[PDB]
Amino acid sequence: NITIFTRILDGLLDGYDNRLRPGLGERITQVRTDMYVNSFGPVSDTEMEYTIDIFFAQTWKDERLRFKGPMQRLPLNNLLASKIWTPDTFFHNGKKSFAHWMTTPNRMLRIWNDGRVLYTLRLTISAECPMDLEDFPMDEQNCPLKFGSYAYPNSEVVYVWTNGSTKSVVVAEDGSRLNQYHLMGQTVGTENISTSTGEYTIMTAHFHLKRKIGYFVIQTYLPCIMTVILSQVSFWLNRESVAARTVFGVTTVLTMTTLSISARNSLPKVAYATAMDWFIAVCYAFVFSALLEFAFVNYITKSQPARAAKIDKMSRIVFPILFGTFNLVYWATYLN
Amino acid sequence: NITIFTRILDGLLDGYDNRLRPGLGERITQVRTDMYVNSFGPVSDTEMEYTIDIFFAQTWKDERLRFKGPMQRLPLNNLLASKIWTPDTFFHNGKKSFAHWMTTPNRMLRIWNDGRVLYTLRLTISAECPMDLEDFPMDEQNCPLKFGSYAYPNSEVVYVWTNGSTKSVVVAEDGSRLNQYHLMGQTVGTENISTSTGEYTIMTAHFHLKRKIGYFVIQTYLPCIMTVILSQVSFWLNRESVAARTVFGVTTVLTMTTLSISARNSLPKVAYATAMDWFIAVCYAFVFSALLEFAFVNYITKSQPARAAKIDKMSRIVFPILFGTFNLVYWATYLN
Amino acid sequence: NITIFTRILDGLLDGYDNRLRPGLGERITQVRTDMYVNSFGPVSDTEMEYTIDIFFAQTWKDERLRFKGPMQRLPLNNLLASKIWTPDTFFHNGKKSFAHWMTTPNRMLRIWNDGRVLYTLRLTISAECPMDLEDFPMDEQNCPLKFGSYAYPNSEVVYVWTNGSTKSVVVAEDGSRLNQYHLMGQTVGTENISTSTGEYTIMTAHFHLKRKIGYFVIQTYLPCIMTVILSQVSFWLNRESVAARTVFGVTTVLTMTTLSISARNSLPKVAYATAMDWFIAVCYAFVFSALLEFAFVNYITKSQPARAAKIDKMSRIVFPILFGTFNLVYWATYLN
Amino acid sequence: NITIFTRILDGLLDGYDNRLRPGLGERITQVRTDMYVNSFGPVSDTEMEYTIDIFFAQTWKDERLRFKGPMQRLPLNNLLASKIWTPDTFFHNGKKSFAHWMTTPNRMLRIWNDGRVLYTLRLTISAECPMDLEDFPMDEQNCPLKFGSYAYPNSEVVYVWTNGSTKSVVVAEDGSRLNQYHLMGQTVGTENISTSTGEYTIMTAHFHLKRKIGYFVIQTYLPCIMTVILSQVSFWLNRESVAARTVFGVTTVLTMTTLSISARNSLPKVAYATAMDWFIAVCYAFVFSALLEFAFVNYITKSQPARAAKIDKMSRIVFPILFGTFNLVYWATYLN
Amino acid sequence: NITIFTRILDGLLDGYDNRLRPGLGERITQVRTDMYVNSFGPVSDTEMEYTIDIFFAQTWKDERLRFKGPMQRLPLNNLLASKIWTPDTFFHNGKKSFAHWMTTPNRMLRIWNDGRVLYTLRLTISAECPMDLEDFPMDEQNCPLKFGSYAYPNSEVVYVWTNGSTKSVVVAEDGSRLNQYHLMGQTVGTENISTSTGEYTIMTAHFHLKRKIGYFVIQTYLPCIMTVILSQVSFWLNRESVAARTVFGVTTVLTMTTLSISARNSLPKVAYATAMDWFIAVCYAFVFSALLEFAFVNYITKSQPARAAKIDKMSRIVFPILFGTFNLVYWATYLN
Numbered sequence A, B, C, D, E: 001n002i003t004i005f006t007r008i009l010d011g012l013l014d015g016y017d018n019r020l021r022p023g024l025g026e027r028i029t030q031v032r033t034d035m036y037v038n039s040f041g042p043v044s045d046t047e048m049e050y051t052i053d054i055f056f057a058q059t060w061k062d063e064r065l066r067f068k069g070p071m072q073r074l075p076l077n078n079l080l081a082s083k084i085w086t087p088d089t090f091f092h093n094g095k096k097s098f099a100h101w102m103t104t105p106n107r108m109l110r111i112w113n114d115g116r117v118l119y120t121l122r123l124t125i126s127a128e129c130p131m132d133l134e135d136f137p138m139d140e141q142n143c144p145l146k147f148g149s150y151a152y153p154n155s156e157v158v159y160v161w162t163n164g165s166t167k168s169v170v171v172a173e174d175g176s177r178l179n180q181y182h183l184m185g186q187t188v189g190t191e192n193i194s195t196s197t198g199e200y201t202i203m204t205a206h207f208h209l210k211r212k213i214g215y216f217v218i219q220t221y222l223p224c225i226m227t228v229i230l231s232q233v234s235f236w237l238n239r240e241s242v243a244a245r246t247v248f249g250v251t252t253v254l255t256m257t258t259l260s261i262s263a264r265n266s267l268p269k270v271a272y273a274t275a276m277d278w279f280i281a282v283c284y285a286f287v288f289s290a291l292l293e294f295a296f297v298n299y300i301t302k303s304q305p306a307r308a309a310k311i312d313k314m315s316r317i318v319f320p321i322l323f324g325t326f327n328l329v330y331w332a333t334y335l336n
C-alpha cells in the first residue's frame, strides 16, 4: 500500500534531467510567485538595509512529472527538491540572504497528477533600502524587493504574480511590528530590464513605511524646547546680576551643541541638512541670540540705561512668541 | 555476537524510503514532543529577541522499523538519522536557529522492537519576543515558542505534548538565570491555524518573565531622586545669593536632561512614553519649577520682599512633601 | 614496503561498522579523557561566558581494530576518523563550540596492535560561567567545564580521568594570561546525573579564577577618592564666599553621579548592590553631606555665627578622619 | 524533442577532464572579463576596507565543448559548472569574499556551438582600500580592485578586458550611493607582476572617490566656529566682571577639547595631523588666546588701566578679523 | 595531445593512498616552508590578537608521484589536492583561521618528474599576540607565528625554512601598513617541544612592531598639557577673586579626571600602571596642587597677607618650570 508511492517516485526520476527547464524549445516556462511575510525585521537606517523573513513560494507546470495513482497529491520535503529542476530565483537587491536549516531545511515539494509543482522556501533577506532623509523624521520610505531569474531570460522564464495584489503578498498581523516605523501597505509590480546578458523580467514588491514620531520628541525636540525656555529665564533677572545671567547663556549654548552631536550619532552620516537639523539650528539661534542681548545690554547699561531696560522687558515677550510661532509653522509644515 | 546488530540495521534499511512518512494513506502520524531547557539565554530588549538552548525531542511510531533480537533497544547516533524519515519540524517565530556539531552532532536515535522511535536534538533558538513596554520596568513579558510541521498539514502529522505540562517542558535549576528577568513559570498549548497551504497544528510554549528591579534604581531613579533633593537645597540659601542659587537650578536641570538621554540609550527606541519616562518628567518639573520660584522671587524681591520671603520659606516644606507623596503613588501604583 | 600498511587499513575496515560501539552487549565501554589548555580566552562578564581553547583527547579500547605488522603504531589523520566509531562527546554547558579546519582539520588517530585508540581534537568552547558579583571586584569565580556522552548512558559508556588531576588537565604557562583574572588552579571530578533519557556520567573540570585588582582602582576608586578630597577643600574657604563653596558641592556631587553610571556600563546589569556600589554610595554621602553643612552654615551664619564657625573648623578634621577610617574597614573587610 | 539536449550534455562530459585547462601545451588560454557593479557597499574608514557587490563574468574558448544541434545556445545553471574546468580567479587584495547561495547559487553557464563559454558569478568583496588622510576631509581616494589567476601564470592564462573601459566596467545608477562619498568615475588597467612562483597578469580596476563635505560641517566645524564666537563675547564685557568673563574662557576651552576627542572617535587612529586637526588647533588658540588677554588685562588693570582698556577695545575687532581671514585661506586652500 | 596528461594523472592515483605519508618506515619526511605576507591586518590591542593574510607554501618530496612525459611540470588546482597526501600543518597559536573560497579555493598543486611537490595556500590567521604594556605607548611588540604538524612528530615530519630568513619570509611593501604600528623587520627560528603525545618541531616567525606615536599626543597628552597651563593662569589672578580662581581649579581637575577614563576606554583593561598613566597622574597633581595653593592662600590672606602674596608670585614661576622639566625627563627616559 505504501510501496506504490515508492515506484511512482522512481518512475518520475527515470529519464528526468534536472539541468533542463520544462518545455525547453517548445514553449516559455511560466512561474507564479506568492509571498507571505512572517515577520518584518528591523530597518537599520545606518546601513540603509532592512531584514525581512518570508515564505517565498513558486508554482510552475512540468509535464515530465505526470503520474497516475490513488492519491492526487504527493507531499514531500527537501530530499527530492535537489533531484528535480527548480528556477534560479535570486534577489537583485539582497545583500545577504540565508535560509534556516534547523530542525530540517524548511522546504516543501507538492506535485499533482497534471504535473503542477509547488515549491515554498523560507528566507531571511537583508535587502538594501535607500532613504532620502530630507524630511526626517517626517519621512516616508518605500523599500522595494526585487527578484528574478539569474540565468533564464524573459524569453524562457517569466514570473507573474498570482491572483490580485492582496493575495500575492500577505503580511502577518504580528509580523509588521517596527519600533520606529508603521507598515502602511504593500504593492507589487512587474517590469522588463534590458541587460547585456539579455532581457529579464523583474518582480518588484514595495512596502510603504511611515516613520512613527515620539521617540525623537523625548530624545531631541523636548530637551531643545526646554533649553530655550531655560535661556529665556535670564530675561527676568536683574541686569547687574552679570554672573547669574552669564551661566544661562553659556550653559544653554553648550547644551544645544552636545544635543546636536548626540542626536546625529544614531542618524546616518548624511551630507545634507535634515528637518531636525534646521529645528536645532533655530533653537540654537534663540539661546545664542539671548546671550547677545545680555552682552549688548551690559555694554550700554552705563551710558543709556533707559534703552537697556526697555530691551530687557521687551525680550521677555518677543522671544517666547517667536519660538512658539516657529513651532506651529515647523510642525504644521511637515505634519500635513 | 556483534554481527547480529549489523544484520538488523541492514534489514531495516532494505526497502525503506526516507521520503515517505510512516503510515502514509493509512492513518495520521502522531508525534509526541518533550522539551528540556538546558539554559535560557539572554533576553535582548533592543532586538526584541531571546536566546534559548533546549534538547528538543520527538517520539513517533513507525512499523517499518520493527525488528526482533536479543536486545530490546538500539541506541545509535546521527549517522543513521539521515537514513530514515524524520518530521520537518521548524519554529514559526525563530529568526536564526543553529545546532552544535562539536565534538559530534548532538543527536540520538533509539528504536524499540514495536517500532517506536525517539529522536532528540540540541538547538539554540534566537526567537523573537515582542514586548509592550508600557509599564516598564514594572512589566511582565510572556515570550512564546511556536513550532510545527513545515510540509505536513494537520491531516497528516499531528503534534501533541506528552503527559502533563510539567513533564512536557522542563527548565534546569541553573538554566533560568537572567540578569534582568525572573522565570516565573512555563505553560504549553496547542492550536490549529488555517493557511493557504492548509491547516497546520501549532505547539506553543509560553515563558512567564518578571523583570527584576534594582538595576534601574541605581542607574536612573536614584540619580534623579538625589538631583531633586540637590535643587531643594537652594531654598535654604539667601535670596541675595543670586549666583549661588543659579548654579543649582541650571546644573540640576541639565543633569536631569542628560540622564533621560543616557537612560534610553539601552532602552529600545519605542515611540511612546514609559512609566520611567513619566517619573523623569515629574522629577524634571520639580527642578525646573524650583528655578522658576527663584526667578520669580528675584523679580519681586525689590517691590514686596515680604511675599518673596514667605514663598521661599514655604517652598522649603511644600516641595519635599510633594516629591515624597508622588513617589508613594508612583511606586504603589505599579508595585501592586 | 609501504603497500603493507595499505592492506592493514583495508582489512580493519572490512566488516567494521562505525554505528556500533565496541564491545556492544558484552561489556561497558571505558573512555579515558585527557585535556590540555593551549590558551584560556577572555572571560566576558557581560555575557557570563568564557572562551577556552583545548586539545581534547579520548582513549578507548576496540578489539575490532587489532592488527599485526612490523610497525607497532599507525599514525593517521582525520581521513580515517569518520570511517570508524567515535564517542558522541559534547559539552553540557557549551553555548557555541567550533573546531579549526585550517590548514587541515586538527585531528589525530593513533592505533596500536592491542586495539587501543587515541583520538585528539582541537576545540574552542564558548562556555557559560555564571558569577555571583556580591563581592565584586573582590570576587572569586569557579568556572566549570562539563562534558559527556549525548546518546550512550552510564551503563554503556563511562568517562574517567587518566592518572591524577595534574596530568588529566594541563594549562600552558603562556595560555593562562587574562587581563582581569588570575588562574589560581584547576580541579576535576566525576558524577552521575539522573535524566529522563537515562543516567549519564558527567566529567566536570573547575578553574579557579581570582580577579586582579588595579584596573578599577585607576578607573573608579581613585576618581571617587580624589573627588571627596576636592569637596573637603570647601571647608577651608570663608563662609561669606557663598559662590566659591557652591561650585565644589555641586560639581563634586555631579562628578560622583556620572562615575557611578560610567562605572556600571562595563559591569553586567545585575539587579543587586555590589561592594563597589556601596563604596560609591558612601563617597556620595560625604560630598553630599559637605554641601548640607555649607547650606546649614549659611542659614545660621547671621543668627549665631559662633556655632557656624565652630562647625566649619570641626568639619575640616572630622570628615577626613571618617573617610580614611572607612577605607581601612572597606579594604580590610574584603582583602582578608 | 527534449531528450536531444540530454544526449549532447552527456557527449561533452564524455572524455572531458575538468582538471586540465583548454588548449594545454598547444596555445595560451585567453580569458575576457567583464564586470557590472550592482551596488557599491559602504566604505569603512576605520578598517580601510570597502564592500562591493558585482556580477563578475569571464569568457573563454574551449574546443572540447563543441556540439551540433538545432539550438545554438545552451543556457544552464551551477549544476554543470563544477563538471567542467573554470579559471581559479581570485582577488589579490580581497580580505573576505563570499557569494550568495539563496535561493540558488547565482551562477550561469552558457555554451555556443563554436565552444565559447560564458560564466558569470555574483560576489561580495570586502577589499582593502588604504587611504592617505592628509587632506581629510578634502581628500580623494582611489580604491583599486585587483584580481587574477592563482595557479596559472601569464604564460598559460591571460586576462584581458573586453571592448573599452566603459563596457568592461559598468556601475548601476542607484548602486553608487554612498553617504559620505561620490563615485567620480572608474578606470581599468592590466600589468604583469614578477613573483617567485612565476609571472601573473593582474587586472586592476580603480574607482575614483570624492568625499562629500557637509556632515563634518554640522559635526565639527560649526560647533568650533560658534565656540570661537562665544569666547569673543567676553571682549564686550566689563573688565571688573572677572567672574563673568572667566566662565567664557574656561567653558569654551573645554568645549573645544571635547570636540577634538569626539571628532576623532569616528576618524581612523592615524598617527599624523589632518587638515581638520589644524583647524581645531587654530580655533583652540583663539579661545585660549582670548583667556590670556583677559588674564593679562586683569593683571595690569590696577597699574595702567589706560592700556588695559585699549587692548580690550582692540581685541573686539582684531580677533574676529583674524578668524574670518583664516577661514578664507583654509577653505580656499583645500577647495581649489 | 591533451589526452596524454589525463593518462598520467590516472596512473599516479592508481595504487596511491592519501592516508600514508611518503617514505613511511623508510626515512623521515622533510618539508620546506616559505611564507609571503600579502597584507598585515590590524593589530587589536583589546583582544591581544592580530590578523595576517599570507600565501603559505610547503614543499616536499614524494616518489609515488614520479612520471615521465613531454611536459616537465603539471600545474593544477585544488581538485587534485584532496586526492593526495598533504601535511596536517596548523598554527599552535591561531585562534581562528579561515581560507578564501571565492571565486575558487585559492590553492595550487605543482608536481615535477622527480616527484617534488609544491602546495601553496592562502590563509587569514587571527593569531594571539600577548603584549606587555609597561612602557605604553613607547612599547615594542614581538608578535610570533607558530605552526607545525598536528599528528606527525619530529621523528616523522620535519619542517625547515628554505634558503635564508629574507627569502623564507617576505612582506609586501603595501602590506605592512598599520595605523598605529611600524613593521621594523621579521625573524624566523626552529625548535623542538617535548609533549606527552611526542616531540614536534615548531616553526616560529617573529614580527618586530614599533608603535608609532602621534595619535595619543593629539588624544591624551596635548589636552593634559594644555589643561595644566590653564590652571596656571589662576596664579596671575587677584587673590580676592575667589570665585574666578575657583572655576579654574575645579574645572581643570574634572577635565583631567574624564580624560583618564576616556583615554583608557580604548586601552586594554590591564591591571597595572602604564607610562601614560603616570604622566596623567603627574599632570593631575599639578592642577590639584594649584587648587591647594589657592585654598591655602585664601586661608591666611587675612592674617599674614605678605607671605600669601609671595607664594602667589613664586607659584607663577615654580610651577611652569617643574612641568617643563618633568616633560624632558619623561620624554627622554622613554625616547632613548
Ligand SMILES: CCOC(=O)c1ncn2c1[C@@H]1CCCN1C(=O)c1cc(OC)ccc1-2
Pocket (backbone or CB within 6 Å): A034, A035, A036, A038, A055, A056, A057, A120, A121, B092, B147, B148, B149, B150, B151, B195, B196, B197, B200, B201, B202
Ligand atoms: C503562501 C505559500 O505558503 C507558504 O509560503 C508557506 N510555506 C510554509 N508555510 C506557509 C504558509 C503560508 C501562509 C502561512 N504559512 C505558514 O506560516 C505555515 C505554517 C505552518 O504551520 C506550522 C506550516 C507551513 C507554513
Ligand SMILES: CCOC(=O)c1ncn2c1[C@@H]1CCCN1C(=O)c1cc(OC)ccc1-2
Pocket (backbone or CB within 6 Å): B034, B035, B036, B038, B055, B056, B057, B120, B121, C092, C147, C148, C149, C150, C151, C195, C196, C197, C200, C201, C202
Ligand atoms: C527530554 C528528552 O531528552 C533530552 O532532551 C535529552 N537529550 C539529550 N540529553 C537529554 C536529557 C533530558 C533531560 C536532561 N538531559 C540532558 O541534559 C542530557 C544529559 C546527558 O549527560 C551528559 C546526556 C544526554 C542528555
Ligand SMILES: CCOC(=O)c1ncn2c1[C@@H]1CCCN1C(=O)c1cc(OC)ccc1-2
Pocket (backbone or CB within 6 Å): C034, C035, C036, C055, C056, C057, C120, C121, E092, E147, E148, E149, E150, E151, E195, E196, E197, E200, E201, E202
Ligand atoms: C594531551 C593529548 O595530546 C593533545 O591534546 C595534543 N593534540 C595535539 N597536540 C597535543 C599536545 C598535548 C600537549 C601539548 N600538545 C601540543 O600542543 C601539540 C603540539 C604539536 O606540535 C606542533 C603537535 C600536536 C600537539
Ligand SMILES: CCOC(=O)c1ncn2c1[C@@H]1CCCN1C(=O)c1cc(OC)ccc1-2
Pocket (backbone or CB within 6 Å): A092, A147, A148, A149, A150, A151, A195, A196, A197, A200, A201, A202, D034, D035, D036, D038, D055, D056, D057, D120, D121
Ligand atoms: C555583464 C555580464 O552579465 C552579468 O554580470 C550578469 N549576471 C547576471 N545578470 C547580469 C547582468 C549584467 C548587466 C545587469 N545584469 C543583471 O543585473 C542581471 C539581471 C537579471 O534579471 C533579474 C538577471 C541576471 C543578471
Ligand SMILES: CCOC(=O)c1ncn2c1[C@@H]1CCCN1C(=O)c1cc(OC)ccc1-2
Pocket (backbone or CB within 6 Å): D092, D147, D148, D149, D150, D151, D195, D196, D197, D200, D201, D202, E034, E035, E036, E038, E055, E056, E057, E120, E121
Ligand atoms: C611563495 C610561494 O608562492 C606563494 O605563496 C603564492 N601563492 C600564490 N601566489 C603566490 C606568490 C608568492 C609571491 C607573490 N605571490 C602572489 O601574490 C601571487 C600572485 C598571483 O598573481 C595574481 C598569483 C599567485 C600568487
Ligand SMILES: *[C@@H]1O[C@H](CO)[C@@H](O)[C@H](O)[C@H]1NC(C)=O
Pocket (backbone or CB within 6 Å): A154, A190, A191, A192
Ligand atoms: C515584458 O515582456 C513580456 C514578453 O511576453 C511582455 O508580455 C510584457 O508586457 C513586458 N512587460 C513590460 C512592462 O513591458
Ligand SMILES: *[C@@H]1O[C@H](CO)[C@@H](O)[C@H](O)[C@H]1NC(C)=O
Pocket (backbone or CB within 6 Å): B154, B190, B191, B192
Ligand atoms: C485541531 O484539529 C484536530 C483534528 O483532529 C482536532 O482534534 C483538534 O481538536 C483541533 N484543535 C483545535 C484547538 O481546534
Ligand SMILES: *[C@@H]1O[C@H](CO)[C@@H](O)[C@H](O)[C@H]1NC(C)=O
Pocket (backbone or CB within 6 Å): C154, C190, C191, C192
Ligand atoms: C556512577 O556510576 C558508576 C556505575 O559503575 C559507579 O561506579 C560510580 O561510583 C557512580 N558515581 C557516583 C558519583 O555515584
Ligand SMILES: *[C@@H]1O[C@H](CO)[C@@H](O)[C@H](O)[C@H]1NC(C)=O
Pocket (backbone or CB within 6 Å): D154, D190, D191, D192
Ligand atoms: C604582459 O605579458 C604579456 C605576454 O604576452 C605581454 O603581451 C604584455 O604586453 C605584458 N604587459 C605588460 C604591461 O608588460
Ligand SMILES: *[C@@H]1O[C@H](CO)[C@@H](O)[C@H](O)[C@H]1NC(C)=O
Pocket (backbone or CB within 6 Å): E154, E190, E191, E192
Ligand atoms: C630538533 O630535532 C632534530 C632531530 O633531527 C635535530 O636535528 C634538531 O637539531 C633539533 N632542534 C633543536 C633546536 O634541538
